[PDB]
Design a binder for this molecule. Structure first.
Ligand SMILES: CCCCCCCC/C=C/CCCCCCCC(=O)O[C@@H](COC(=O)CCCCCCCCCCCCCCC)COP(=O)([O-])OCC[N+](C)(C)C
Ligand SMILES: CCCCCCCC/C=C/CCCCCCCC(=O)O[C@@H](COC(=O)CCCCCCCCCCCCCCC)COP(=O)([O-])OCC[N+](C)(C)C
Ligand SMILES: CCCCCCCC/C=C/CCCCCCCC(=O)O[C@@H](COC(=O)CCCCCCCCCCCCCCC)COP(=O)([O-])OCC[N+](C)(C)C
Ligand SMILES: CCCCCCCC/C=C/CCCCCCCC(=O)O[C@@H](COC(=O)CCCCCCCCCCCCCCC)COP(=O)([O-])OCC[N+](C)(C)C
Ligand SMILES: CCCCCCCC/C=C\CCCCCCCC(=O)O[C@@H](COC(=O)CCCCCCCCCCCCCCC)COP(=O)([O-])OCC[N+](C)(C)C
Ligand SMILES: CCCCCCCC/C=C\CCCCCCCC(=O)O[C@@H](COC(=O)CCCCCCCCCCCCCCC)COP(=O)([O-])OCC[N+](C)(C)C
Ligand SMILES: C[C@@H]1CC[C@@]2(OC1)O[C@H]1C[C@H]3[C@@H]4CC=C5C[C@@H](OCCC(CO)CO)CC[C@]5(C)[C@H]4CC[C@]3(C)[C@H]1[C@@H]2C
Ligand SMILES: C[C@@H]1CC[C@@]2(OC1)O[C@H]1C[C@H]3[C@@H]4CC=C5C[C@@H](OCCC(CO)CO)CC[C@]5(C)[C@H]4CC[C@]3(C)[C@H]1[C@@H]2C
Ligand SMILES: [Ca+2]
Lengths: 92, 92
């Protein structure tokens, strides 16, 4: 679940924030939102940053249409596979 | 879960956005919100678009009172039936 969390966070942070000098915020922002996503959050007005209903209308640019797909695959893997692998674990 | 997701998304998008020329956004918007709904999101200030507490006071019009019902049935089917069909699957 932390390999799935960087599989999504490193592309999401690269695809969306491409003018990043080296920083420690590149250590949070590849781990931060993909962790809270597991716990009910979706950041719905940050998915599809080029949409009109965006809290991030400045993150729009080349390649940012990939992140709704990455995140779709992410949460499917988190909730529908890995969280139910915990539940199944805790049951048995 | 993707038949339930278009069973809700195609009516929700037709009942609410009825002046739609053909577009590729009719390929996202019938699949987009009903997927994030599965993962904690409800879009609470977009249900009942004619309510006062609406992020969508312009989507109000004839027939939009149907979507709180469609969505009620949707999530009942997603969470309370299909997500617990996954959990039950992953257990056994
Ligand atoms: C292989 C296993 C099976 C996979 C299943 C299928 C996989 C998914 C298939 C989805 C169908 C294809 C959808 C995109 C179509 C083109 C979009 C487009 O042209 O523009 C869109 C751009 O926005 C995007 O391109 C973002 C990507 C869409 C969301 C991805 C799906 C995630 C949720 C669902 C995942 C599961 C759904 C389940 C399906 C029932 C919107 O239009 P625009 O105007 O260009 O943008 C606004 C910009 N503006 C404000 C500046 C104007
Ligand atoms: C499934 C049931 C639903 C319907 C199905 C029918 C599908 C028909 C779809 C057809 C796709 C083609 C339409 C888009 C091209 C036109 C231009 C366009 O909008 O470009 C967009 C590129 O966005 C994309 O390229 C979207 C993703 C393309 C793949 C579609 C899903 C593949 C099938 C599923 C499997 C995939 C894997 C999923 C995981 C397993 C960019 O537009 P924007 O984002 O608005 O950015 C604009 C702002 N900017 C200029 C600053 C950048
Ligand atoms: C067979 C199995 C049984 C199923 C169960 C029962 C089914 C549900 C039964 C529901 C009772 C009926 C409710 C609607 C009553 C009429 C509403 C009305 O006239 O006005 C309302 C309009 O808003 C709507 O019409 C939206 C529809 C109602 C919400 C849907 C319920 C979903 C959640 C519950 C689902 C779980 C139910 C749990 C039950 C305990 C509000 O007033 P207004 O002022 O017109 O609106 C503001 C507009 N204005 C700003 C322009 C003024
Ligand atoms: C359960 C316990 C709770 C209470 C029970 C008692 C129930 C009493 C209910 C009575 C309903 C009649 C009252 C409304 C009629 C007056 C006019 C009106 O306000 O119309 C509204 C339409 O809203 C509707 O038509 C509401 C939905 C009708 C069905 C109600 C549930 C049936 C029982 C459950 C089975 C259903 C299936 C459920 C799923 C299995 C329009 O108002 P608006 O929406 O604000 O939009 C107006 C704005 N506009 C002009 C721009 C358009
Ligand atoms: C059965 C289903 C199979 C489908 C599978 C998917 C196949 C299709 C895959 C990908 C479709 C690629 C085309 C969509 C982008 C067009 C829009 C665009 O250019 O947007 C932006 C840039 O976008 C880019 O710069 C993206 C460049 C192409 C893709 C880059 C690699 C990612 C895909 C890797 C492969 C992933 C494969 C995944 C396989 C699972 C900007 O828009 P513009 O128009 O350039 O200019 C601005 C707008 N204006 C001019 C109006 C002002
Ligand atoms: C035991 C329980 C069983 C109950 C079952 C449900 C039975 C009840 C069924 C239906 C209730 C229909 C009446 C409610 C709407 C009235 C308000 C209205 O007209 O709103 C708007 C339009 O609304 C429309 O154009 C809707 C037209 C009728 C319904 C269309 C088919 C959908 C239901 C299919 C059947 C579903 C069957 C589902 C069965 C599971 C506009 O408002 P107005 O008033 O036109 O004028 C403007 C407002 N003003 C004048 C104040 C300025
Ligand atoms: C197996 C896993 C693969 C992924 C991963 O773990 C192991 O690989 C690690 C490598 C790390 C980076 C290494 C070096 C730096 C330079 C630093 O520069 C300070 C500059 C300035 C600040 O202003 C000082 O003043 C910023 C941080 C950064 C980019 C790391 C970020 C986290 C990264 C990407 C880690 C990531 C979680
Ligand atoms: C069994 C399932 C039943 C539901 C469903 O899957 C199979 O049936 C599919 C039919 C698809 C539409 C067919 C043709 C077009 C025309 C196109 O026109 C470009 C216009 C312009 C852009 O501005 C060009 O420049 C836009 C897309 C649209 C409306 C499709 C959307 C997705 C739909 C609704 C699919 C939906 C998920
Ligand atoms: Ca939740």
């Amino acid at each position: 679940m932390a390999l799935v969390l960087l599989s999504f966070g490193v592309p999401r942070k690269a695809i969306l924030y491409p003018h990043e000098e080296p920083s420690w915020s590149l250590a949070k922002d590849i781990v931060f939102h993909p962790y809270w996503m597991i716990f009910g959050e979706v950041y719905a007005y940050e998915i599809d940053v080029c949409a009109n209903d965006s809290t991030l209308p400045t993150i729009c640019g080349p390649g940012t249409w990939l992140t709704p797909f990455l995140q779709a695959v992410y949460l499917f893997v988190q909730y529908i596979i890995m969280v139910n692998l915990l539940i199944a674990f805790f049951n048995q």
